[model samples]
Target chain A: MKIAVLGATGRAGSAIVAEARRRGHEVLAVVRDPQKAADRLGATVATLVKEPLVLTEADLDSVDAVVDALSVPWGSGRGYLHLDFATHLVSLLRNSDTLAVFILGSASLAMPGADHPMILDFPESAASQPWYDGALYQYYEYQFLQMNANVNWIGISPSEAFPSGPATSYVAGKDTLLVGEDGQSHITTGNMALAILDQLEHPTAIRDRIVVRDAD
Target chain B: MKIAVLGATGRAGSAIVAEARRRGHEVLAVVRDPQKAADRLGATVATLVKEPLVLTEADLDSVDAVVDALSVPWGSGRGYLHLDFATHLVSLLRNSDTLAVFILGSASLAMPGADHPMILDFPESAASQPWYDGALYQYYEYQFLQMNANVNWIGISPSEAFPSGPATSYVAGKDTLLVGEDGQSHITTGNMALAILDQLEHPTAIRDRIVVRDAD
Candidate 1:
């Protein structure tokens, strides 16, 4: 299988490229900075497809799926970037067979017994103006994806927080946010990469959202 | 008041351009072909801004609001175009004070005492693959706008059927579909134009959807 990862300079992206190669699939690291992607992922991790807005049919068709790890500076008073970029990429994938698996925000995921989603009832302490704006837009991103009847889109939200880590065992759920065996709501970069690869290999949720977390 | 009307070549667009000029406000018709716009809207209707995607700050700043009548063929097998183009335009506006008023699909508006919207409960009599797809995406378009946190966006839904006609009286409501005094649920292009100009000059709803109908 062949895959392209947008925002390949980010943590989850580099991890995805690493795990993708480890699994022996071809990789295309789609980014604005090829050198940064090369530096982070090493000299020969994956072929680079730079030029954010100028993606071509040849480059896009080369991949079976696209794992969107795209992001912009949080709270830079421009958090709308998340929603804007997601829409832009989704537009580009129209009528193409390339599946868009968006890494959604946990803020829109519901807790087991909660009435409203986390974004509606935003967390107080861990939140800032910029992050809040970004999360809100990501929540909107999920809504936008749900309404797409034409695109081959699947949304996946990780645990409450995703930090840097190596690939390990993981758990998956649908709609609801997950708590790991340690009673913590978090996922690691490696596990997210693992989840993306697994979804790409065998897509189960078409035009829907899924949840992933670190295993106990 | 100054306004920019997109898709100024169509019925709703021409109506808006004519009505806006009659009210003594400067107008900018955002279209791809200046000659076509001039032909359809008369020689000296409004200032022309060609290139659908290359709008700049000076042009954007020149207007107080944008009335988007932009649309494609109903089932052009490209209903996703509505959602994609909207996201593109919204991304361009960002946090700017320029207001974006979207002319949304009426099928998504709630019918009187109905549990779901007309779009979700599509009528059997008037169903086609292309139209259904277009309405579904426009429904998504409204959802996307509601989730917008940065752009100064607004949405308006015409009556179930929007046929071409001259300016007549009209009625308006928020979110729910409205029926005219004659018991018909329809709005003319002129009425839609009236609603747009009304909203632009006076400014009522913000970050929400409104429905308009032709009066008896």
Candidate 2:
């Protein structure tokens, strides 16, 4: 299968690129700088969009699916870019056969026995922190996806304690955040890439969001 | 109050520009082409951004309020631009004191005695119509506004039968299609602009949507 990995230099994006190549599928590593991505990943960079928002359909020509791993750094006062990027990608893919996979944060995941997502559990004082903007926008990203019906897309939400680590057996659940076998809520990029590829090869969560965590 | 009206050459935008200037307030007429706007409205064109989606914060500098009157021509296969423009405008105005007044469609308004908005009342076959995309995205635009808490914004939905005409006495209601004394649910651009300017001067519907129509 042919695939396009946006933000191919980022943690989750890099892992996905490696896993796709290891499985012998063609990988299109999309990045800000082709030179940087080629040097780091040593993979063929299919498209280089200096600005993610400016990416157009012609740039994504002939790819089977697009893994939207683009992210805005926390505390940039532009956390709203998450929602902006989602709108751009989804709008461009409307009524098309291309699949869109969005990497999301756990902020919008359901809490145990709670009506609201995990975001509402944060203290009111947390609203002033710079980190809070990115978390809130992640939740907004999921909401924005729910409003669209013409796009072929799915969102994957990582656990609240996501950390850098190697791939492992992973558990994929729907909507709720799951705890690993050790009794903690977390996952790593390697495990996340596995789950993403699994679903992409055989999609069951079309137009919905699914949660993933590292299994014991 | 100083105001910047986007799409200032359009029907609703032109009326709002006229009304704002008539009241002795500074009106910044934003448009795609300055010469066309100057020839048409004969008003001062402050900022001209060719593509509405590419509008930036600097383009809207120093305005007390923004009247987002942007529209996408139906059947252009780009009805989703409605949501894109909303996200762009709202994201730029986050955490600011500048008031954002959005001109929305009545599709999102409640169907009296119905659980859902009028959009749901359309038959499933309507989804195939090129016009349905615009109507649905307008509803999504209102939903997008509901998710944001930082921007000081208000959405004005004209009656279902909006038409072009001169100013007249008007009525405002909350979240429902309003019926005029003539027993018709309609409003002219002139009447809609009056409600917009009235709210801008006194702001009774901050962070919420209101429905407006012509009076008997």
Candidate 3:
């Protein structure tokens, strides 16, 4: 299958590219800097070169699957804005025949009784940290879950400590958050890539946030 | 005032310690490992060295206020088992004179739509992720909210993005997901710390989860 990976130069993106290639699938490494991605994955850069707001339907036409690993650094003087990238991605997917999967943070995952974790219990003091871009990521994840009824999209919420390592082993549950026997949370970059690819292969967590962690 | 920070080596625990010190309060850092927390704010380690099955009244004897920053990584093997720690903490607070503020995740924030996001959309195949831990966190957040009627305990949720920065500004909402004007979701880690401290300073969000974000 053909796959498009956004943010191909970053840690998560590189892992996904490696995993996809290891599985022998056709992979498209999408990135702003093709040179940075060249050493990682024989990634060919497909530059949309358009403003995020003006991205059109033709921008994502070629691939059979798309994995967005986009990152916006927090406190980079880019004021917090939910640009609705997921909505646009969903729209693009709807306009095409591609299956899409969004790699999301744990913020969008809901416990049995709460709305979503990040939105509910975040500390107010840390809002100004340089790495605060996670909230926007969460927004995109929510948007993907909210707007993708028409297309096949899967939102994967990695363990709380994301982009770290590999899946120690994750449990699977629908709607409910997966709890480990030891009561700790974890997910590795490798395992998360595995989970994302698994979804691509089987199409299980479509249009919903699937929280993954190491299984006990 | 004397303050105790549970999980002092954790993200939120360090913040609570710093904030309390900033406010000129004497601080005690309650941690399982003193060496690991050596860099913290001259914290005084607690008597209970391990995760207790139940928190007895003796646990709350000296501290005037408690801030729980205890968190398990999502998808870790230890996620579900941590609920016992929460129960123990709540039990100790319930039976003691200590005023407590619990740092909770967004899992408790309930959205408006009846078509539950997870149930309606999450795939059966992606069920093994640590999504269940979020639910358990929410359950414990609610349990503490309900169980500690006699104590001062408030639950706070971060925005969609877990912003890591200084607390310059924030928005506040009760019992619902607070979406910013940008149609995105966010909360700074500093702001989350500030929210918990605000609750400690003045009891808002008591018995409920408060969603906080960058104020417009």
What lDDT tens digits, residue by residue, belong to model 1 across residues B94-128?
76788888999987888888756677776675555
True contacts kept of 2: 0.67
Q: Docking quality tier of candidate 2? A: medium
DockQ of each: 0.77, 0.53, 0.01
Tens digit per residue, CA lDDT, model 2, A68-145: 887878779777788877877776676678888999988888886666687878899988998888889888899999
Q: Looking at model 1 chain A, which ten-residue stretch has the lowest summed lDDT?
A: A48-57
Model 3 spans with C-alpha error above 4 angstroms? A43-55, A77-83, A111-118, A129-133, A166-169, A174-183, B1-216
Best by lDDT: 2
- Candidate achieving higher TM-score, 1 or 2: 1
Give candidate 2 regions above 4 Å deviation: A1-4, A24-49, A56-64, A72-78, A112-132, B1-4, B24-39, B43-49, B62-64, B72-78, B111-132
Give the top-scoring candidate (TM-score): 1
Each candidate's fnat: 1.00, 0.67, 0.00
Q: Name the lDDT value of residue B136 in candidate 1.
A: 78
Model 3 vs. true fold: TM: 0.45
TM-score list, all predictions: 0.86, 0.83, 0.45
Screening candidate 1 with a backbone cut-off below 3 angstroms (N, C-alpha, C), the clashing residue pairs are A75-A130, B75-B130
- lDDT, model 1, position B24: 91
